[PDB]
Design a protein around this ligand. Structure first.
Ligand SMILES: CC(C)(C)c1ccc(CC[C@@](O)(CC(=O)O)C(=O)O)cc1
Ligand SMILES: CC(C)(C)c1ccc(CC[C@@](O)(CC(=O)O)C(=O)O)cc1
Ligand SMILES: *[C@@H]1O[C@H](CO)[C@@H](O)[C@H](O)[C@H]1NC(C)=O
Ligand SMILES: *[C@@H]1O[C@H](CO)[C@@H](O)[C@H](O)[C@H]1NC(C)=O
Ligand code: NA
Ligand code: NA
Ligand code: NA
Ligand code: NA
Lengths: 468, 468
């Protein structure tokens, strides 16, 4: 039942009030926040707000030293991305790109599945995986209403494509922002090593491989009659024409998005001040002053504030802050040092086995919790391991955060799967059967990526000095 | 027109790019953000996000040193207050307290006005002045539909009562939180001198005086037939019974609110860690696990997350951060020192005249802009003045922030007045005529308060050492 999850663990709080060793107190905080992460008896952001409420009582950190960790460059970056995504959503743009791509590739189940997967991934690279699948599934439903395995195939394709595309852009989804925050906190001498450009270079090639493998696996398991070609076009056309002409505002938001991309990349092809958060905020601001209509007086702009107050995941701006506060408390108390001293004997196990095992463990784990909690709970542990054995932490921290996005079964794993399920014929057993193999595929692809071309970018074959 | 406000000022940006003196650059940033404060061509939060976008370009602060100033104890305090206010709003509680008070005082225009003003003030002490007036005006409309001066009187009473009650609790409204943030930033050795208790002691007596004077002034200007007594009761009763019985959840939220009050006060009747933000977060968290219904299984709690994501002013969590970033940039660049050296000659003007003049200036100013922008623009200036002449900064910083809430004409001054106007018969001239006198009243009351009983609490007759 739901009662025990937050009444029995609290009963241990008087146990550890004295506990003349702060790292025990920080460990209890982390364990409690993890127990509340996996089961949502209490929402995620509320659990993120717990460190300010517990570190003081445990005499670890003051209230200010804890709260001033809840906003940093990473949160601003994610917030700017979210606002741009709101601008994209308000004007039905993505529903235009998608419905043009579908009419381009064709109306054939083999090609139609590829179109849906590719579109969903490309959108999810910037558009908050949940939202893009929420937008795309209705199109699939409309098509289907006009065997029993095509339905499952397409429904799974939406979610897998979203979860895979998300792990290409540093914004993408929470886990990558969490990685950036942990790198800035634990390893601050890494001024800018995981940027938008570096992460995009390391990860974008990977998601193409994962998408190809997923498409092959799906068309092998569920696909192993011209009406379904001549009656899906009659739906795509009649759901495309409803969008009207090119909608002048869409052009301006597209231009702003391209400017955002160009500024993110061109920046990194003397006392830098101008990190990517500045760019994201710049474009988010520009979105409020652009006309959105032909002046012929300045017509109503692209974005009001009501829209971006109603439609913005603000809780994921506190969740990452909770992660950062946890990292700060771990550094202050002495938990990271203890974990480092308790993981020396791993100096004999070869690093590749460590990376593979931990990636598989994280992939299994994230089918129960959310994909952000997994990272903010695991990454400090792997970072402490790496310092103590003589590795470059990125070796173990990149595949882990890529794997945390491998939620391919257990609808509870990530919202997209739940959204896909809500529509009917996607019995859960099918998800498990088709998702275990996809988790294996993702782990193999990630291992290949990190061991082949992620070593030249980050120099993972040497032990640096920003990890003392 | 709206075009010039954000295309001509930007044209000065290339002028000051070089400008081998950082304080000029910080001054330009502040002036631009002020110009965008007064006229809302670009929303307020977006302007608050500007420092991260401009200080880097001007080589004042990095992006992290700027963004890590956007969350602090004050923002958490205000956020907890906001969440509790959401819990109050979701269950129509305040509409129960109010409609019981109205039936208690009576149905007579003289007594009815007092009931409305007192209720609106008491609610606004915790409930985000805008929201309480939004809730209360419909009751007045319902009553009126069943001379032409009663309408104006009641409509003005709602807004004046809200704006006056807000300035009693440290949360209350933005200006007081801004004062707390500026005290923590500019004067950090003032560990805890303006708390909830101290501010409540200094300000709560003042708002009773202001409410009494406002009620007298209104009943003198607009009030200088038993049907209006026997047909407002027939409305209050029929709008009270619709609320049903005491609504078990209301009891629990009331208990949580009382616990919040008791924890805020009892705390201050060795290396403190437990500032009021901890209490606010504690109660905000408790609001998510309390049943909200009789278990008889844990029924749905008082607060979900959808409700507190839809209904929470998140932008005022970035606005205060913008204020703090401005203060940090002023300290870093060298603008505060310059302003201190340019305000020595005021060492001859007696302090009381300074306080009165500045309070009146701020009261006039805040009839154009918002009440938060005024404080975050003025308070650093007054703080720099005080250090250089030999005063206790609170002397000039308390009345200024109390006066910034004196928006009693010019609907654009603060949202409550606009809400009141939207209902009809409140011609603007009436607002000016009845508001100039009320601004004078507020200034006089504030001067009396600070000069009589605000000197013992804060020791304003000596120059401390937390102001070097
Ligand atoms: C509680 C709120 C509403 C603030 C919230 C928190 C976390 C997410 C996760 C979004 C995700 O990153 C998926 C993932 O991380 O599992 C994606 O892009 O779909 C979404 C919303
Ligand atoms: C832009 C958003 C929506 C974030 C926003 C900003 C500022 C306020 C002010 C609230 C005020 O403090 C009045 C006052 O300060 O003028 C009160 O309590 O009514 C309200 C909302
Ligand atoms: C930094 O490096 C020094 C030299 O090995 C090491 O002793 C010290 O513990 C390290 N400090 C941190 C904060 O990593
Ligand atoms: C603190 O006090 C010293 C002594 O007067 C003064 O010289 C110095 O400028 C002050 N520093 C700050 C940061 O106020
Ligand atoms: Na995404
Ligand atoms: Na998951
Ligand atoms: Na208020
Ligand atoms: Na105002």
């Amino acid at each position: 039942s739901f009662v025990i999850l937050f009444v029995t663990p609290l009963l241990l709080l008087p146990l550890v009030i004295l506990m003349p060793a702060k790292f025990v107190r920080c460990a209890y905080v982390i364990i409690l926040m993890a127990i509340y992460w996996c089961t949502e008896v209490i929402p995620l952001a509320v659990t993120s707000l717990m460190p300010v409420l517990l570190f003081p009582l445990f005499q670890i950190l003051d209230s200010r030293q804890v709260c001033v960790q809840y906003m940093k460059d990473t949160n601003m970056l994610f917030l700017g991305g979210l606002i741009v995504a709101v601008a994209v959503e308000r004007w039905n743009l993505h529903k235009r790109i998608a419905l043009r791509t579908l009419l381009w590739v064709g109306a054939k189940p083999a090609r139609l599945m590829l179109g849906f997967m590719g579109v969903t991934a490309l959108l999810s690279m910037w558009i908050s995986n949940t939202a893009t699948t929420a937008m795309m599934v209705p199109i699939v439903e409309a098509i289907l209403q006009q065997r029993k395995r095509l339905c499952k195939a397409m429904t799974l394709c939406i979610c897998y494509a979203a979860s895979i595309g998300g792990t290409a852009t540093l914004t993408g989804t929470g886990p990558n922002v969490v990685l950036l925050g942990q790198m800035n906190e634990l390893f601050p001498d890494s001024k800018d090593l995981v940027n938008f450009a570096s992460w995009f270079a390391f990860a974008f090639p990977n998601m193409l491989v994962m998408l190809l493998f997923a498409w092959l696996w799906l068309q092998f398991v569920y696909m192993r009659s011209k009406k379904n070609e001549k009656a899906a076009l009659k739906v795509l056309q009649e759901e495309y024409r409803k969008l009207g002409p090119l909608s002048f505002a869409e052009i301006n938001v597209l231009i702003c998005f391209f400017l955002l991309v160009i500024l993110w990349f061109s920046r990194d092809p003397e006392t830098k001040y101008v990190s990517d958060a500045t760019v994201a905020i710049f474009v988010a601001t520009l979105l409020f002053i652009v006309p959105s209509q032909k002046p012929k007086f300045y017509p109503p702009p692209l974005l009001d504030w009501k829209v971006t107050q109603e439609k913005v995941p603000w809780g994921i701006v506190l969740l990452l802050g909770g992660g950062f506060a946890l990292a700060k408390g771990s550094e202050a108390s002495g938990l990271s040092v203890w974990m480092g001293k308790q993981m020396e004997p791993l100096h004999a196990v070869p690093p590749a086995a460590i990376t593979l095992i931990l990636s598989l463990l994280v992939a299994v784990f994230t089918e129960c919790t959310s994909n952000v909690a997994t990272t903010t709970l695991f990454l400090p542990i792997f970072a402490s391991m790496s310092r103590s054995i003589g590795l470059n932490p990125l070796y173990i921290m990149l595949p882990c955060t890529l794997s945390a996005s491998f939620a391919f079964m257990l609808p509870v794993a990530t919202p997209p799967n739940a959204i896909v399920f809500t529509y009917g014929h996607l019995k859960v057993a099918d998800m498990v059967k088709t998702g275990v193999i996809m988790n294996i595929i993702g782990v193999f692809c990630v291992f290949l990526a990190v061991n082949t071309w992620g070593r030249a970018i980050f120099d993972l074959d040497h032990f640096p000095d920003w990890a003392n």
